[PDB]
mmCIF file with all atom_site columns, C-alpha atoms and ligand atoms in Angstrom:
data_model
loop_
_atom_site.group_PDB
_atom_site.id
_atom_site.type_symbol
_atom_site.label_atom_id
_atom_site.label_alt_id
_atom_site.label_comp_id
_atom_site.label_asym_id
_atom_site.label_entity_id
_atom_site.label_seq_id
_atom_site.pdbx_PDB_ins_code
_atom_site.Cartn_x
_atom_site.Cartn_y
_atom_site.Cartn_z
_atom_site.occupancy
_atom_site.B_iso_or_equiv
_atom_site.pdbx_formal_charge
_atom_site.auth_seq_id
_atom_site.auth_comp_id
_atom_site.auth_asym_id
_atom_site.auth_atom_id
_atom_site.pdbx_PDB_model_num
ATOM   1  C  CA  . UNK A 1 1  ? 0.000  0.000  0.000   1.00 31.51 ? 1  UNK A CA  1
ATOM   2  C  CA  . UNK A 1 2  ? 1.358  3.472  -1.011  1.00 33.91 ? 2  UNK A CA  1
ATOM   3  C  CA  . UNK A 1 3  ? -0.431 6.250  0.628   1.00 30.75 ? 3  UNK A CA  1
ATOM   4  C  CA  . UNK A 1 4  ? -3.078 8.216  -2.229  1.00 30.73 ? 4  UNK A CA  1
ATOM   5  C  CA  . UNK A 1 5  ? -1.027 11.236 -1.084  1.00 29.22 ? 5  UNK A CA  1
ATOM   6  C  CA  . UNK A 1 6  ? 2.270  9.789  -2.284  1.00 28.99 ? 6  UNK A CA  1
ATOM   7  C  CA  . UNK A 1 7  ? 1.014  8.812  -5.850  1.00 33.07 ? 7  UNK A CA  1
ATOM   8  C  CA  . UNK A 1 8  ? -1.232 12.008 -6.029  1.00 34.13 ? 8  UNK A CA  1
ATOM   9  C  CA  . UNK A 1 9  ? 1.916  13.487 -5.861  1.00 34.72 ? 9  UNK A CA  1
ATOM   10 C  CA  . UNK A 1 10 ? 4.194  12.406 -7.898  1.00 35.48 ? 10 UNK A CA  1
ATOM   11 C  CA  . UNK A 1 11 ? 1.456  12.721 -10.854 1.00 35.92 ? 11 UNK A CA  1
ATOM   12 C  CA  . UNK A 1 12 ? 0.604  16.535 -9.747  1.00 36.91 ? 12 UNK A CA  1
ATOM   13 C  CA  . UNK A 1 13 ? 5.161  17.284 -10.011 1.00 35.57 ? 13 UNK A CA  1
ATOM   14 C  CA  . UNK A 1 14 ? 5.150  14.742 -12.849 1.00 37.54 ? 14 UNK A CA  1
ATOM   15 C  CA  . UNK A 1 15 ? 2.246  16.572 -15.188 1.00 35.56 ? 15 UNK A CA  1
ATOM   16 C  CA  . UNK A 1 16 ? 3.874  18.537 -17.693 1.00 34.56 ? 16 UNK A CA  1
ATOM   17 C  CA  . UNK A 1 17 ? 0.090  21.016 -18.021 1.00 33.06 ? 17 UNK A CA  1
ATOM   18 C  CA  . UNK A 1 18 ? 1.260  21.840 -14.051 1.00 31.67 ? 18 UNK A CA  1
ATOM   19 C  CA  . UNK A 1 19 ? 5.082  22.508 -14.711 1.00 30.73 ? 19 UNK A CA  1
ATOM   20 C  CA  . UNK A 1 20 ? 4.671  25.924 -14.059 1.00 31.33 ? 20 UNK A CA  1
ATOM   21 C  CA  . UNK A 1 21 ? 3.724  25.611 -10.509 1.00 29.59 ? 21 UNK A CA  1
ATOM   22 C  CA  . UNK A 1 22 ? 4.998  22.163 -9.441  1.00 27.12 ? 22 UNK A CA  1
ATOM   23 C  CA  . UNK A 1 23 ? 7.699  20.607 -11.365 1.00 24.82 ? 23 UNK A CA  1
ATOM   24 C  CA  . UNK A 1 24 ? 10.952 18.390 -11.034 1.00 24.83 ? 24 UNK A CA  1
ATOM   25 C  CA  . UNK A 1 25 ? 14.505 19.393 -11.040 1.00 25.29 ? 25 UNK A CA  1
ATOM   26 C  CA  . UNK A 1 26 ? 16.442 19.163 -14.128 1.00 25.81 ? 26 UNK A CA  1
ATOM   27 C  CA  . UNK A 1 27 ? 17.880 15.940 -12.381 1.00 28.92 ? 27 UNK A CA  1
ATOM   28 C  CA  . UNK A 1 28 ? 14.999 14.854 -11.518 1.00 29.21 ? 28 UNK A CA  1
ATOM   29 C  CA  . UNK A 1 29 ? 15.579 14.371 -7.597  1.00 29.36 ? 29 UNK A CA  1
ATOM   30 C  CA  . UNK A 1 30 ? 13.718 17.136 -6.133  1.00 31.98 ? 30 UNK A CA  1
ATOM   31 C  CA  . UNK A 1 31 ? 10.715 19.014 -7.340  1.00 30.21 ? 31 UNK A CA  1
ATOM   32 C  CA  . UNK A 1 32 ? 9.913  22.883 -7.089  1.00 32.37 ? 32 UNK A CA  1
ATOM   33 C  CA  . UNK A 1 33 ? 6.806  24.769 -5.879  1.00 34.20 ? 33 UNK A CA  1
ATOM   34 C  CA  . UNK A 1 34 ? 6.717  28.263 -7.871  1.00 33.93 ? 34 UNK A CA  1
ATOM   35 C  CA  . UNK A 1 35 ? 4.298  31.068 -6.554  1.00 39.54 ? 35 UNK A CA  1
ATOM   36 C  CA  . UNK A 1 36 ? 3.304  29.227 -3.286  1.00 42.09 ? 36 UNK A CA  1
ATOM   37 C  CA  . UNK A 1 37 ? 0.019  31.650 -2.779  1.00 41.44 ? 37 UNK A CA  1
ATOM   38 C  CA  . UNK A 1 38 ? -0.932 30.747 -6.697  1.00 40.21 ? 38 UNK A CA  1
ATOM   39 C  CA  . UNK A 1 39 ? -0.089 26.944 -5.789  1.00 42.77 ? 39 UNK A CA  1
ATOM   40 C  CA  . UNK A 1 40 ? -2.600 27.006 -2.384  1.00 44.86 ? 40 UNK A CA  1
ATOM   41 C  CA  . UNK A 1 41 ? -4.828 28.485 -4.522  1.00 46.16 ? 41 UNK A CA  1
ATOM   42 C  CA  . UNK A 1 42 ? -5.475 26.377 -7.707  1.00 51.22 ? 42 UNK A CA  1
ATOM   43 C  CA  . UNK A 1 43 ? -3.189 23.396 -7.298  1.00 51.56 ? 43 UNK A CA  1
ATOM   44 C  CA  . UNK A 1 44 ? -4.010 22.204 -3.653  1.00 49.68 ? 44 UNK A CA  1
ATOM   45 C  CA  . UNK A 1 45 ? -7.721 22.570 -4.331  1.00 49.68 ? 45 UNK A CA  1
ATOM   46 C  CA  . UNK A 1 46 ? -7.906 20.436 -7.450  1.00 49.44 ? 46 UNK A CA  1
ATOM   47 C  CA  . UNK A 1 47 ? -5.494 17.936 -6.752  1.00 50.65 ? 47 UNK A CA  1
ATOM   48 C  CA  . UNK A 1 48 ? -5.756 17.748 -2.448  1.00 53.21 ? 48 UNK A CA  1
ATOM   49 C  CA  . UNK A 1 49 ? -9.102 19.240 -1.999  1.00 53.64 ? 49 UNK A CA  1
ATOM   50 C  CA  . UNK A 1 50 ? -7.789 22.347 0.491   1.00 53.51 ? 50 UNK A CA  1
ATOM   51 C  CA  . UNK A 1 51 ? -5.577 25.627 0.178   1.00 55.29 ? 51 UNK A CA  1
ATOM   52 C  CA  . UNK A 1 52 ? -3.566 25.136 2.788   1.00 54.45 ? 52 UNK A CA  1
ATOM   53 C  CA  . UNK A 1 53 ? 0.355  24.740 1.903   1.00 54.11 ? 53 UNK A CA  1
ATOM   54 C  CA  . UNK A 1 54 ? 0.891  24.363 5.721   1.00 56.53 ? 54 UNK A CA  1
ATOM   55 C  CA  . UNK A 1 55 ? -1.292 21.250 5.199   1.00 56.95 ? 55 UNK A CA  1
ATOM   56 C  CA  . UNK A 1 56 ? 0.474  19.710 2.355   1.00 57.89 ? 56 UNK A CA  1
ATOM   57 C  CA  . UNK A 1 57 ? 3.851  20.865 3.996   1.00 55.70 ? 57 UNK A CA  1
ATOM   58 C  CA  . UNK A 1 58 ? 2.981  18.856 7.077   1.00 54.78 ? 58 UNK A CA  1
ATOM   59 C  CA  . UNK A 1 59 ? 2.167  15.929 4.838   1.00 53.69 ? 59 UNK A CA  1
ATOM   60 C  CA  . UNK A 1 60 ? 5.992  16.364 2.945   1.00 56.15 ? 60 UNK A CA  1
ATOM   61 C  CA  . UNK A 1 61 ? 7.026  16.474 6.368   1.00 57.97 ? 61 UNK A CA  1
ATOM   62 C  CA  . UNK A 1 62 ? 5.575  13.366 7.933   1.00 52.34 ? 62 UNK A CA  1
ATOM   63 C  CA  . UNK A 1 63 ? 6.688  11.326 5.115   1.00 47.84 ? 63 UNK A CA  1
ATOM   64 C  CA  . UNK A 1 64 ? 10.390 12.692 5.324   1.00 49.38 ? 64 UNK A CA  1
ATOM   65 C  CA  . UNK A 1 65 ? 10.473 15.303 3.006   1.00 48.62 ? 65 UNK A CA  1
ATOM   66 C  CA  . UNK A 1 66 ? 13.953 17.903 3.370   1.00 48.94 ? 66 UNK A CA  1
ATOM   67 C  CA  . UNK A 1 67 ? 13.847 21.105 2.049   1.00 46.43 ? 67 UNK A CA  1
ATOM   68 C  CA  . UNK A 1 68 ? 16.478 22.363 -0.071  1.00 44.34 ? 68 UNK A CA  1
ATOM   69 C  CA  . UNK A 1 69 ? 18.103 25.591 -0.351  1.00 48.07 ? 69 UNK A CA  1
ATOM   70 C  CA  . UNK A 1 70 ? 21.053 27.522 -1.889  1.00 46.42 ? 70 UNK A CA  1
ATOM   71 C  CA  . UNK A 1 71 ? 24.427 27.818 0.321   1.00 45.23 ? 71 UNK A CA  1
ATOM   72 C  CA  . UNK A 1 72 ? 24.761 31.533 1.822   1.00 46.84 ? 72 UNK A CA  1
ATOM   73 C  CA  . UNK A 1 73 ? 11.586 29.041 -4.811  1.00 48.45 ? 73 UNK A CA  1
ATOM   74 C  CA  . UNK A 1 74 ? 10.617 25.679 -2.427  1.00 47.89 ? 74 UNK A CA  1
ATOM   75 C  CA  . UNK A 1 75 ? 12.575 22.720 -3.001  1.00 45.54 ? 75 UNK A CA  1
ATOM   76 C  CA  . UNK A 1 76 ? 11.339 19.642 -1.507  1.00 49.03 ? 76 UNK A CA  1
ATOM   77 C  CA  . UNK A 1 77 ? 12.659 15.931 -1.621  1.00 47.58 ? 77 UNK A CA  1
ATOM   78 C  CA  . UNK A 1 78 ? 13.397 12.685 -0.928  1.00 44.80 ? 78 UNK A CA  1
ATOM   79 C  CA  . UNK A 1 79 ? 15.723 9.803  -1.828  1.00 42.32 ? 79 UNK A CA  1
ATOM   80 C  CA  . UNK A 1 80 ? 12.835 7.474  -3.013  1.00 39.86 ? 80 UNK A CA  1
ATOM   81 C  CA  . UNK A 1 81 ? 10.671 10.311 -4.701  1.00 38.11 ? 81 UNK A CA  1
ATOM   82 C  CA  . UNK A 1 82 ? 12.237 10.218 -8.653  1.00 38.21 ? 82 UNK A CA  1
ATOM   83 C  CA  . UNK A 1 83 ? 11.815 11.387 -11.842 1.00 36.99 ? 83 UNK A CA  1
ATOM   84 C  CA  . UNK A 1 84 ? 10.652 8.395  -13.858 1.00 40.33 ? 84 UNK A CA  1
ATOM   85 C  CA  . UNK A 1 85 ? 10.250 6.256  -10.999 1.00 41.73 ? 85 UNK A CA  1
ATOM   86 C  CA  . UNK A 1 86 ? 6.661  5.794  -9.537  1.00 39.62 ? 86 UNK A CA  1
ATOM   87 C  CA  . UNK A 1 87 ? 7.668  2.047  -7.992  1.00 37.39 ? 87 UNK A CA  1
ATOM   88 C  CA  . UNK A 1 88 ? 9.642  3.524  -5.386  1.00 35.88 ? 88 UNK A CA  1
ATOM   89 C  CA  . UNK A 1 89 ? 7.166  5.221  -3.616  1.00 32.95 ? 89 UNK A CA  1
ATOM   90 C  CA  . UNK A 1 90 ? 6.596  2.271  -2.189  1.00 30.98 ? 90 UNK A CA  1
ATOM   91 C  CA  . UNK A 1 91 ? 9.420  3.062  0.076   1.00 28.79 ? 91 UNK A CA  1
ATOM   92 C  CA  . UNK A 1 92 ? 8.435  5.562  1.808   1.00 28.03 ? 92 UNK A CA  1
ATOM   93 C  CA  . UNK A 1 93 ? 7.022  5.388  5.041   1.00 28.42 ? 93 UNK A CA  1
ATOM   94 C  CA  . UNK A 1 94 ? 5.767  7.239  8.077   1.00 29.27 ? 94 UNK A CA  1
HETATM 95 NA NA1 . NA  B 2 .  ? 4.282  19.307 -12.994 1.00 27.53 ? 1  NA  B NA1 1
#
């Protein structure tokens, strides 16, 4: 069993038609979220059913989601959450 929000996900970064909110890195390891109010607005709605980012962030969160940021415009990730590769969702827990 891989948890609706997993899959969900990875379809919503994966579309190309939602690339301009939610997309992945060119390597394909990470995904971005551009224009987070635009994002909670139409993207959560349609796809999670609620404009809350907190929400979905707690979600990333509780499934092990990092954040990633430039060394001294929201990168999220995690090792089993690929480019190309829906199967290993299955390998992420919590
Ligand atoms: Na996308």
């Amino acid at each position: 069993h891989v948890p609706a929000f997993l899959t969900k996900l990875w379809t919503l970064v994966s579309d190309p038609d939602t690339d301009a909110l939610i997309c992945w890195s060119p390597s394909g390891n990470s995904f971005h979220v551009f224009d987070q109010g635009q994002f909670a607005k139409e993207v959560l709605p349609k796809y999670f059913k609620h404009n809350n980012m907190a929400s979905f962030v707690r979600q990333l969160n509780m499934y092990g989601f990092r954040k990633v940021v430039h060394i001294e415009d929201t990168e999220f990730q995690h090792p089993c959450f690929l480019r190309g590769q829906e199967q290993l969702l299955e390998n992420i827990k919590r």
